[PDB]
Paper text:
Amide Bond Synthetases (ABSs) actively catalyze both the ATP-dependent adenylation of carboxylic acid substrates and their subsequent amidation using an amine nucleophile, both within the active site of the enzyme, enabling the use of only a small excess of the amine partner. In this report, we describe the activity and specificity of an ABS from [name] (ShABS), with a broader, complementary substrate spectrum to that of McbA that includes enantioselective behavior toward an expanded range of acid and amine partners in amidation reactions. The requirement for large excesses of amine in these reactions has prompted investigations into the ATP-dependent amide bond synthetase (ABS) class of enzymes, also members of the larger ANL (acyl-CoA synthetase–non-ribosomal peptide synthase–luciferase) family of adenylase enzymes, as these catalyze both the formation of the adenylate and the amidation reaction within one active site of the enzyme and require only one or low equivalents of the amine as a coupling partner. In common with other adenylases, McbA features a larger N-terminal domain coupled to a C-terminal “cap” domain.
Later, an additional structure of ShABS was also obtained from crystallization of the wild-type enzyme in space group P6322 (Data set #3), which had been cocrystallized with the amide product 10a. This ShABS structure (ShABSopen) displayed a rotation, as determined using the Dyndom server, of the cap domain of 81° in the opposite direction to the rotation observed between McbAAd and McbAAm, to expose the active site completely. Although no electron density for a ligand was observed, as the enzyme in these experiments had been complexed with the amide product, we speculate that this conformation may be representative of an exit protein-product complex assumed by ShABS following product release.
Numbering used by the authors: 1 to 163, 170 to 507
Write the structure that this text describes.
Amino acid sequence: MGYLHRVVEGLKANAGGEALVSADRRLTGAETLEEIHRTARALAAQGLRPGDGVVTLHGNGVEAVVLRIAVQLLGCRYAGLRPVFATREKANFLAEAEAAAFVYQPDMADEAAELLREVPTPRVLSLGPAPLGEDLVALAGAQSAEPVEFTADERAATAVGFTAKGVCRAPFDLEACLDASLTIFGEGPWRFLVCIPIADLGGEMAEWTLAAGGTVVLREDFEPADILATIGAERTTHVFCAPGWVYQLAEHPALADADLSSLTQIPYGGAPSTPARIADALEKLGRPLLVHCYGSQEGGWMTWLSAEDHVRADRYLLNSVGKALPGTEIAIRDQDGADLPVGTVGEVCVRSTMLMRGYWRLPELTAKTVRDGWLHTGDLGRLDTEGYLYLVDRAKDVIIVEAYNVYSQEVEHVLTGHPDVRYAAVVGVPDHDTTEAVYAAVVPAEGVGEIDVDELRALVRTTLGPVHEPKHLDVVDTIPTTPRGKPDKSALRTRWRAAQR
């Protein structure tokens, strides 16, 4: 058994039905498994052993999934360049990757040249006929479809996902991730719309979709009109979305008429969500679909918020990423690294069998990052007693000054406690080039004449420490608020930013 055992088992399970689907080609589990075996054989022929690095430059086609899996079957290291990266960044990735092969989609030959020019690589192959190297699809066609058993170290990296640096994953932790996927997404066959690069997260999600006996529906990227069409046309059960995408789906005029019956779930994540707009989306979908996932290449799946937990009447949880997965442990830690009680804000630190094997060729930063089995995620948040995780909103609630975290509520509370101040709003605003500064607006109390701004600066300095001191501090008659009754801190930020003459 193992990760690839699991993928193959799901394909065999699904041999009669659809496994890989795109606008251009359609394969069954039988037809998919054959190509994988053939491709693996062909790659083996070219001279590729376990541990040998295989860099790819492709899109989200069927042959790209076949290749990603095949490379991993041999126990080679698949290293997908996402096409969205700049050529400068790809050349770095390729240079550092110690590649033995380079595999590129035919219509990207322009870029393959730029790269192979700068980083000459052996065994160049093309997914179909193309100017450079040989044609891998042709090589595979001419080849035995006899099964290829997985026979490498289950704990040896077979995938690198790029981020300035590359995250190695081994089958051991990939299976751990697949297990969580069944927790979050449910079990059984999934018709899973993947429009994330197969070069990384999309690839993982395709591997998993297949392992569970499912069909992958591939699109090249997210566009709301496609997708709404694709969902109904392919009777998809799941589409994984960035939060941005969820909003675009919800705001789309085509949505009233689109057929979403097939959907059981719209898992989303990858970036901070906007509670207000998620709530809009809940109303328009008019059904419990949204499931918030919190994950990284480094940490695997860490938490998730069920669909029901988006709409319970007794709690509000749109500011939550939900609770730990089975086998996942979460501590919140001070800038030095001892635990904090529930309720307190710190760095979210995780330990599960889903952690990455490490950063590629960066063994020192790997140790700065995973410390004694515990991933230091660099994200800031708080747990609660019911077990829910809440990541601070970095725009409203933190300010980073000289590499120190300043919390806006802490500064507000201190200012407000001055008898001359009845209300404060504190926000970080862009300063010189790439720094942040603490700005503050305070509302005077009843009868207060003139406010001594310097006194309030001293108060913060000699309560919290020097860095928490507001650089700028305006006395205002009021703080604008949002329609949900929270202080409008982006209005304050925009206003202060624009006035920096």
